[PDB]
Ligand binder design. Sequence first.
Ligand SMILES: [Mg+2]
Lengths: 79, 50, 235, 321, 147, 100
Amino acid sequence: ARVTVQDAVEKIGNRFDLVLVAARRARQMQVGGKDPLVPEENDKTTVIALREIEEGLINNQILDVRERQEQQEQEAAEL
Amino acid sequence: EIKELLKLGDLPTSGQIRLYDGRTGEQFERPVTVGYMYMLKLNHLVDDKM
Amino acid sequence: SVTEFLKPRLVDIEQVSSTHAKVTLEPLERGFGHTLGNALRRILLSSMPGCAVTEVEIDGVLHEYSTKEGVQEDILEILLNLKGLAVRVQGKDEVILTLNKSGIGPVTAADITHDGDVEIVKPQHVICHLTDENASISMRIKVQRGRGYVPASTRIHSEEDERPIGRLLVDACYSPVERIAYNVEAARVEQRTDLDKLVIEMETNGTIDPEEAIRRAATILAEQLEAFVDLRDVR
Amino acid sequence: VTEFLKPRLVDIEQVSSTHAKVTLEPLERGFGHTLGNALRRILLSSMPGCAVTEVEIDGVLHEYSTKEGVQEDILEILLNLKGLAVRVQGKDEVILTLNKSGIGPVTAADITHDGDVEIVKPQHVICHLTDENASISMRIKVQRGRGYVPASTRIHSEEDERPIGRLLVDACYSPVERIAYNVEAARVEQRTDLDKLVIEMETNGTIDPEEAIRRAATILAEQLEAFVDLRDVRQPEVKEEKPEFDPILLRPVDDLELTVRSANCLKAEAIHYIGDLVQRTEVELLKTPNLGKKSLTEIKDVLASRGLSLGMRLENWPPAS
Amino acid sequence: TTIKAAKKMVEREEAVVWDILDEVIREHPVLLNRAPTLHRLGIQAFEPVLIEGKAIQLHPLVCAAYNADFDGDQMAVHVPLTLEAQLEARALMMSTNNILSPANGEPIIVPSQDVVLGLYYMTRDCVNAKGEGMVLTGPKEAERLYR
Amino acid sequence: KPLVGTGMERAVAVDSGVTAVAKRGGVVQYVDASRIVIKVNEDEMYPGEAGIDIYNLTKYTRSNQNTCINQMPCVSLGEPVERGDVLADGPSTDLGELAL
Ligand SMILES: [Mg+2]
């Protein structure tokens, strides 16, 4: 459940990059098959990604680092 | 004229009768007025709008 | 005493008429008066076992949006009048009655072919007015006992049931009570003060019995209260 | 079917161990409102308990006063002691003493721990005392009432006699502090919408809120026992006898959905009762005057289609007329 | 199994389809819109709750943002149909995130006539009534005494 | 019927063409939900080749606004009617009075 996202807009510079990174995370979770770092309460991926970015463990730099780690481990498996 | 017509009946002169709530079953202070009003159903029902 | 006081008891079913009845529940210590009054009023107005009509069948008329040579009123007024009719069934839950009449005159509920378990509360309830001498009416009327109220739209299940054109539907408004008012007063206890006695007046269709209706309402309320009389963490 | 629905709770929230929230779902179309109202009016007014009802200060015997040694006024003392929740055993009236001095404030922990009473919150502050040279003492008489009583009625009951003069407070015999019920819409797979009840309550702490709900339920059950069907079903008994004569035969022949000409030519044979016509085979029909093929077809179809037969052998007729 | 089976199911209107609807409209906000949209508040986002009937139930206060009365107005409703669009409607176009007018910093959440009249009646005090001049210990006890 | 009337309700229901007005007074001979038969009184009957009036009520039929328009009788047998009086209440009428 979620009513307002002010606790998300205070930690990010604005709302546009916020919604962009949150939609990227929700897409990586839905069709990418990623485990949500925050437990779900029978909710859609939207509120899950909102709570993720709200806690502070998922941001733009964090998402970039995660994507880079994914790329490097894929290429290490590819040798 | 309306006052004397109400006086002809057993209805109060002021036209406001104390009403009891159906949910909780208490008395409504400031006696609400209640009467008979003629009303109309307009030709703007929901079955041709939704 | 200070704890474990008494419980009320039914003492009067004094009926000022065949339908307008009055009961006097007594005694009540304090505060229980308005509580029980509102509770019983809401239970009676919400759900009571009714025995109204649910479906009719007339051979002459096909659909309620037509007329019939011989009757003064239209089929819609006939349906409204038979919906306003009240009847009591005892043995079965659903029944089919047959009403056949002829000749000029106001035909009422008395002219129907009653049965043993079927009881007409008031034969003076006019049904139709046959305004022709060589005119006859023959109708089938389905009456089922249920709980609450259901309109004529959602009562249907499939179009295969209402395929007979003669089978016409009407909203089954089966609710015997019409109005239930109540007032608390100072009970006449033998040796005590500020006891409450609740006088409940009821205007109804005369079908249900006042004491029986009160007992049924109290039973429903007690069964609903039993839900959390032993409430615990259960799913 | 005259069979209602029993709710199934899905949330008993016991936050703060003294402020509970119960949910119930689903109910009838309007059962939630009446249930909430009845439970509220029961728990507020008719819910017995134990609380302070008389106070007597051995230094001040007046409502208005300026008692030294304390920075709280006498009205503040009464306000503090009114909320002092205590639990007493079967003894419906008992007094307690609070003779105490010291530096800090006197609280509920300084109450004499008698074997017949118990304090639920000893750390509840009662009176902030002056650090130096402040000797205050008072007694409190508690009773076992039914609910909330105002100050005016208590002052009047004192005005009855008041031989020595007794300081009084707003006694709160209701163990519940507050309660509020709210009805909302509840979805059912087939039903349109039902009542979902949410009752948030908070008590003095002497009893669990669910215990207070159970007590209200059992008191309402005791009140309604005298009217609940006199039993579970009131009729675990069946009796289906069989008469030696069919009631359809008692009714006249004119009640067989037949035409007027058929009834006329049947009355011409002086046959009016179905019990008299059942003893009339077809041999008399084709010989009866004014009986062709349509009238015979009617008198054989609309007569025997009701389960009976045209021509049968009975003897008990007519019982008893 | 197939799309035709699902279509036959949803047209049959059984009971196992209602919980699916409650699940899919659990956190999927829709976009409500007034017929004339002078400013941005004419279009807002709302979490839908299933009601029985044929009309659209709306919060009483938010109508002041649309200047929409209940004399027969007709509002439109749309769906985002996109993860990005749903998330944006939840983030920006939501009614909770839009409380101040774009013209003035004053809230557009000003109460209407009913609630202000109720609160005025609740706050307006007389000189002599039941319980006059007594003392109470808290707001809960006051509410209990009033009930 | 509207309780709080304005007096004009007795005219709008008659001056319109939705109510079957009695062209010639008389006694209602044959009542029916579909038709009405009026026996003309001898005072105003035609002195040569006269008869009875037959008012054919219109049943539930489509209107210009898809609104059900229908006329219903309001008199019984033997009830004498006057010339210009109402015979059958039309749509939204009650005993020769506009009932909106
Ligand atoms: Mg408007």
